[PDB]
Symmetry: C2
Subunit: 198 residues, 2 copies
Amino acid sequence: QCTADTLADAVLITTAHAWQHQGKTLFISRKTYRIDGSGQMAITVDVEVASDTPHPARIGLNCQLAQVAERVNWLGLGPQENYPDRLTAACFDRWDLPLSDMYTPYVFPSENGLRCGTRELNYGPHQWRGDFQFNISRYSQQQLMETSHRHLLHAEEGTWLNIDGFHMGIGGDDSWSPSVSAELQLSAGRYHYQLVWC
Amino acid sequence: TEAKHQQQFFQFRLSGQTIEVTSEYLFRHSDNELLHWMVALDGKPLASGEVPLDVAPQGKQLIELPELPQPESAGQLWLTVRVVQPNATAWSEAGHISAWQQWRLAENLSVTLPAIPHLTTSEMDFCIELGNKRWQFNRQSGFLSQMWIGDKKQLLTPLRDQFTRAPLDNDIGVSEATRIDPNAWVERWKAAGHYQAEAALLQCTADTLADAVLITTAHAWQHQGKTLFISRKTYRIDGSGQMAITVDVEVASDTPHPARIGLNCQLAQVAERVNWLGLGPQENYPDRLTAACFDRWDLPLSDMYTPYVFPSENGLRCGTRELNYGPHQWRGDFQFNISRYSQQQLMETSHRHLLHAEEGTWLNIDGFHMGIGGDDSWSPSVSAELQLSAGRYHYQLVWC
């Protein structure tokens, strides 16, 4: 579905998508975009996950921004990278770091640089507000998946932004068997989050 | 029933498509035991069978189910097993159920898709028509105040948010009659003003979409100038007559976590039966639902009330996808209780024999509900993960 309506003081966009693999519906996403007279775009997301599929790594949004800014400013957890499994050391405050500090250069590339518990994120002219986890870097998730050494990574044209309502734990009791505790898995079946852009 | 389920002498493990049964008996072989199994989409049964149990003390038996059906219709498949004693004993009758277990099998997400309601606005109300149905939103209060089918009214009390419950004995938690406790949940709720919080209207706006009417409201519950909770709701009435309700609630981090987050109304009708698709058939709570089974349940309205001698919050059913009272249907993922007694009357009445049925039927629908505790009844005993401690909450309801 993709439907647009003009309210008294806003424009309402309603969409719905189904992610499918070989005839089986894995996830369903329903979104409303509300653009008001103050220029802000409020995004509401509701997601249903099939109970028989493995719980997903994350639930969130992803885009590649054209601009490349020098600093990332945000109100959330810690200066350093932190995950729902590994955030007891991070502190809630206003943090300012260069864009390079938002990427952790693990020798074997992988998902990295997430910051949880974030209420506000500033990058260039843009501002996002809500309660989300984010990472921001010059490398897409696909490139990190495909590249076996950090020295072979190449910065992309713009900056990749992932904003997640929910993120699964990282585990770590051992690295040769599943070790993410049951309560850190994305097993709720239904999920909801909200985001305001600019 | 929760005690019976947790203490049962057979334990079950499912590794598709094999049920592994483990006996916790120390001395006796399973010679009076028959395993029944059933697969349902909603119940709505699809398949069933019977397997005799032949397991040694502390032994194991693998039970291979035949090819399970794979319907293309949307919905969740559930497997239920029960151990039945076919022969009577000195202490039980033929057919006694001694153990059971349930699992989720396979889900098919619904991917399919589905006159224009007329909105009339006055300075006191927003009033919507569709054919023979009418909804009335009081613009001063911001709540749905009346609903019509034909010419008959459906509500005696407006549909409003509820954040409190009539305190359980675990909530009162004062062992000696003279030793008052400021740490009891009921005392914290009273001191914070949860039972006296007044709702202040923040916004009430109506818009006419292409095929629906959109009502947006917002309220703030305050006690001596301190905002406790904020509720933001959207009501969407479409051309099929259904009203979709979306609720987002923010809870102040410094207030005690509320007993519940949900809605409450008094219906005019008094029907004889309650039919729901969820956990049952008995009363069950987020703390105490391991014994309840997901199925289609039908009970008289009197069975929806547990007559505790000291009145309190009672009769909740969790994990509910659909609820059918007389003419109405509610769909979502919620907990509900339904009875002839309001929460206020249960709070104020000290003996069950002094309760009097009210004019209509009180309905509480909760997105979220606190645990009941029970490790002891003289200190707080609700674990941290069954408390409503998240800052923000969201739930969705369809009223048809």
